[model samples]
Target: MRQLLLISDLDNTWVGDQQALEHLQEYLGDRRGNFYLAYATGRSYHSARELQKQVGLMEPDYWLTAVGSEIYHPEGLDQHWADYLSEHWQRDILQAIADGFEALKPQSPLEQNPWKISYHLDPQACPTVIDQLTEMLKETGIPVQVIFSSGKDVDLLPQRSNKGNATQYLQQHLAMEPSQTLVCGDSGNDIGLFETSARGVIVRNAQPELLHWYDQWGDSRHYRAQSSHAGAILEAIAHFDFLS
Candidate 1:
């Protein structure tokens, strides 16, 4: 059987996914050949691994970290992901975002990588400057993406770098059937994944922006889950008949 692939976000989505996690774990129990799991997040590898270690999320086949700028495949070096990193990348792109804003604070070094530049910006702080920063980048044709999440986290990445983008590459690399893949997320960063052609889900407790966006899309392509976490996955399973 071709296993279903699920790339999920860790924060609100996976934490809340506890109910569904347990149910699936017990049902599958250290034997999940029928499924392939992965986590996509803005978190760095160090931070993500620590949290997953503590919380004991069922181990995933790979980890897409640092806003999908890096990939950690358990087996070994992920040559495909490495090859995708561009030579055109320059630190100056994010440096511009930082130098332009006073409120933005550089996150710890561990959180950064070659392709990703992240910072902390108060969500409500400078509503216009964010646009200014983006416009400035556009004028230079940087071909980059700026992700604002949860009102405090900002990650600057390549135009084609994101959870959805990473998932798509992984799916193709793994030779996955498009019909059997699913991606789940909650906040704006996760939107990259949602926007893709693969099946997706937006948990009930999503940020207001997502809720509004989902409404705008009519969310016809995804399940508007009523549960917050694991519960959301449970609903998704039933909605898609994952186990049938």
Candidate 2:
């Protein structure tokens, strides 16, 4: 049998509803080692570790954090992924351009990583800021991927490194087929994961940005769950018959 791989976002997707989270936790625990569990989150690795301690969430087999700019396994960080991201990544240029925009507030120092530039989109800022940033980055001739999520957070990453690419790399590294993988999320940052051919689960409480993207580009293989948080994930597992 092909290995089952569940890659999910954190925040409002895997967490949020404690009761549902426990239920999902129990479900996965009962079937431990039957499948692979992973997380693709916008949080830094330190933040994610903190959360795991607080919530008692299971230690995933793989971690794609910092908006997927960093990848970690139980053994250690994936230096191969880092090397690939470094090819065209220019942190100084990205930071300088981001600094030029007063409306964009840098996130806490802990939030920034070697391959990610994170920011908070001020509520008072114009909606066009993302567009402007994209144009500016394009003009620099340095390729980068800009992702705005939860309607308030922004991440600038290497053009080739995002949640989707990271997941794809892991999938290939593990020799897992697309049909064996399942991706889940609740916001725009998770949009990259949904773009992959892997089956997707977008919870009912997903942010507008994700809903909007789903409307435009979602495929038949993706499941839009009726439940929220971990409940939604459980529902998708059943819907896809992944546990069987």
Candidate 3:
């Protein structure tokens, strides 16, 4: 039998939902090794760790934090994941990208890693700012990709890194088939991860724009979760027939 993988976003999605929390704890709490539980969050390593403990969850097999810029395993930081992100990174190029925009402000230093940069832009400045950044990247041949979400947040990353990439990479690293993986989230940051082979759930509590984006890509593998929190998670599992 293929092993099951439960990868989810934190913040409002996984946190504060006692019902989902209880459900997960009841099932995978002690049997953590029997399945994969991971968090692909925008939080930092320290913050994610604190949240994991604060909310009373088993230490996940993988922690893909900093918006997928870092991956931490229970044994240690995944060096291979680290090295892959570190290669060809240019902090200065990111600085140049920032130079073009007056509206872009560094998003909390704690929420970033050496391989990624985070910035926030006001909604009014978003369109031009995105075009400006993309064109600059092309002109300079910077080997990076910019992910903007929720109309205000932007992440500069390696050309092939994001939550989706991390999810797929770990699937390979764990030798699990695409069918074996499951992911859920509720915001624009979670968008790219939805484009993979793994089944996905967009919770009812998702931001409206995010939900609109989800609508654009609905399919058998993705469920529009009507429930919130753990209930939605359980709903997705059942939708995927994991419950049966």
Candidate 4:
């Protein structure tokens, strides 16, 4: 039987509070042997690796990065997921379409991946830009998922690619039940992870957009933590009685 599967967002949700994160590490020490861990992030794999080096966070069994456009294991990329996401992903076409918008500034090359197009925008203009871009993409006959997060960051990904879908993929691949999984996040980009049927934790420091979504759609399995970052996760684990 699976003990627990914890998948968390890497930035604000997992590392913001170093002291709490360290305590979490200590608490999971040997107990982690019975747990499956993963970090889902908007960061590229290289960036995630760099952060790991800087913080020495526990290595995850899987890396769901580039806003869930890419999945990696210790050995390398997960070809199965890649093939699934590749179905209608035409990066060149997506990029060309996105370039038509003047308000959208391209993110660094490091931020763009085969299955993801990243951008930065003025939060004030996000509503207009997202609406226009989404309408344009809808007419292309190609499926896309638009994610506007942190008030300024925007991403276009294949319809089937997102944190929730990636987490679901892992559950199936590992033959774990939904109850065995605990998904944690702290921003709008992480909303997909919380949308899943699995247990969800929304850290106290989460952005307003995510909190707004939670207020309307969060279910019985969702826990809005009073703490921020790693401390929030620890609180959720206890609330769910995962340790037992």
Candidate 5:
């Protein structure tokens, strides 16, 4: 089985200070023949593609989006996502979540708008209100998933969706075993990926909640590096014994 390294939470963790793409290209240049590149992020496919263009990342072998509620091959992007989401359970669950958002909009601080099938609040809303919206979503029997990104923005995805699930999916699709895969991230939302992966690395600038989760889980590796993506990536690769 081929070894894989699944990278997620791209906004800051992978694409920080606009140097991420440059650093990533340099990092992967050496190991390009041995590993596969995949993105496990909360961004929608459109946004992911836009980032890819901006950052100039090579077309990833796999693109996991909508927090893992959807997965797309670099080749068939939209068609694959649309087909995967066609399953009855996925469609019903997503619709219910959308309805829940519509129901709660009157009381929400931000205007709720549909992004693909999922709903999101305006970026200017208060964090507390976003938390309340998540609570309200749960009460509606929809079990929505909430992730706050580096942009200080919160998103609502399917409860079953997340970076961990996406990483696992990529592992299986790539015909790799869990032990051969590694994940690196730096936030609360990344906790799930850390728990599920065979190995997880937390960057130096990781959020406190993420650090606390690592302490609680106890299986993943944690490292502190300079507060830059290039530094973090190099430190993590070395810690994983990928480089000297």
Candidate 6:
């Protein structure tokens, strides 16, 4: 039976401090066939691709980007997602959010950081305004979901999107049973995966609420809140007897 391993959340969880890619390369070396590696991240496909190139990740069999809004198969890197913003509804929603950001720019506590194709707000933005803007955008029927990370960064994507849902989708597609899969992550955004997976491992830096919640509702043997990503991954491997 092929075991499925869903490695979700790239930033801070896996690739922080520049050690992640190197560690992952060593960890995955000559063992690619034994497990499947997939990424469930808030990054868009374009951003994910750049990171992959930077890290030299062995092209993943599956890439779940935009949280769970987009799924890509390795073959031709084909995509399975709702249509990109070609129609008016999606375009209108995006435009409204941009306009709102511009209108509220002076009032925004966030710093404007523009990417090649997208822009991000710094952590200083008022949550209330962010929430209001998100609601306004949603009213357009675009299905965008807003996520606030670390009280500073905000991500906008599909409402039906989440790392857990993306992992579940990949699990079902791979025909792997929940019992055979293990997941690890490090933030509040990762809590969904912790809840959905049979075995969820949270790194040491995870949010306090997530650790508390997992301690209360999760299976002791199936859950771990380790002190670091390396520690969490090591513990999961040991628990599953994968390290041998």
**Candidate number with greatest TM-score:** 2
Better of 1 and 5 by lDDT: 1
TM-score of 3: 0.90
Which residue pairs show collisions in model 6? 109-124, 110-125, 123-152, 204-226, 204-227
Q: Which stretches of candidate 1 lie over 4 Å from their true place?
A: 16-20
Off by over 4 Å in 4: 123-126
Q: What are the models' TM-scores?
A: 0.91, 0.97, 0.90, 0.97, 0.72, 0.71
Tens-digit per-residue lDDT, 1-244, candidate 4: 5688899998999988889989988888768777888899999999998998888789888999988899998789999899989997787887899988988989998888889998888655746778899889868878788898888898999989999999999898778777988999988899999889899999999998899999999899999999999999999999999968
Expressed as tens digits, the lDDT of each residue in 169-231 for candidate 5 is 667667876666667677766766876845666777777767777677756354445555545
lDDT score, candidate 3, position 139: 66
- Evaluate model 2: give its TM-score: 0.97
Residue-level lDDT for 186 in candidate 5: 78
Candidate 5 residue pairs in backbone clash: none
Q: Give lDDT tens digits, candidate 6, residues 1-244.
A: 4655656577766666356456655776667777777777667677888887786655677777765556777774333444432223354446456555742432132221111013345456555776677777778777665555555445555555567777777787788767777777776566667767557677777666566667787675455645465556656766776624
Worst 10 residues of 1 by lDDT: 22-31
Clashing pairs in 1: 16-229, 16-230, 17-229, 17-230, 18-230, 20-230
- The runs of at least 3 residues in candidate 6 whose Cα sits more than 4 Å from the true structure, single-residue gaps closed, are 17-24, 83-91, 94-122, 128-144, 207-222, 242-244
Candidate 5's displacement at residue 92, Å, is: 9.1
The per-residue C-alpha lDDT of model 4 at residue 202 equals: 96
Model 5 earns a TM-score of: 0.72
User: Order of all candidates by lDDT, from best down to worst?
Assistant: 2, 4, 3, 1, 5, 6
Q: Write the per-residue lDDT of candidate 1 for residues 1-244, one digit (tens) a residue.
A: 4568878888888775566667755665545787778889888878888887776777788899887888888875466676666756666755765667887878788877778887888656875667777777666676788787776777788876899888888898788865687777888888888887777888888887677767777455678888887667667766877645
Ranking 2 against 4 by TM-score, winner: 2
By TM-score rank, best first, the candidates go 2, 4, 1, 3, 5, 6
Q: Number of backbone collisions per candidate, in order?
A: 6, 0, 1, 0, 0, 5
In model 2, the Cα lDDT at residue 77 comes to: 95
